[PDB]
Amino acid sequence: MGVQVETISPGDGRTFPKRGQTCVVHYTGMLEDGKKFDSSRDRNKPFKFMLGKQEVIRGWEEGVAQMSVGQRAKLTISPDYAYGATGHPGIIPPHATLVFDVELLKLE
What we know:
The protein is mainly beta. The protein contains 1 helix and 6 strands, in the order E-E-E-E-H-E-E.
């Protein structure tokens, strides 16, 4: 499968990221069992990435573009849209489905 987006709290429902914009987000990343492997909130610094430059996993590129500014959403990402068969040594196992709690703070 691809990426599923499940809403947690609504945004403005009007402003969606376009290609080339910088997305400023807080996020928490968890394995399918619920173990957290990454979180911007723990570092007290939002994460920025430019949509369309493939600086993040495909699931983020397609999932976050579906969010409006101010929305918090749950992205469930299958391995093909994520770290795939390889995974990431000692962080993400092979063939892992990931769950991201993501809040789109603003666009730049």
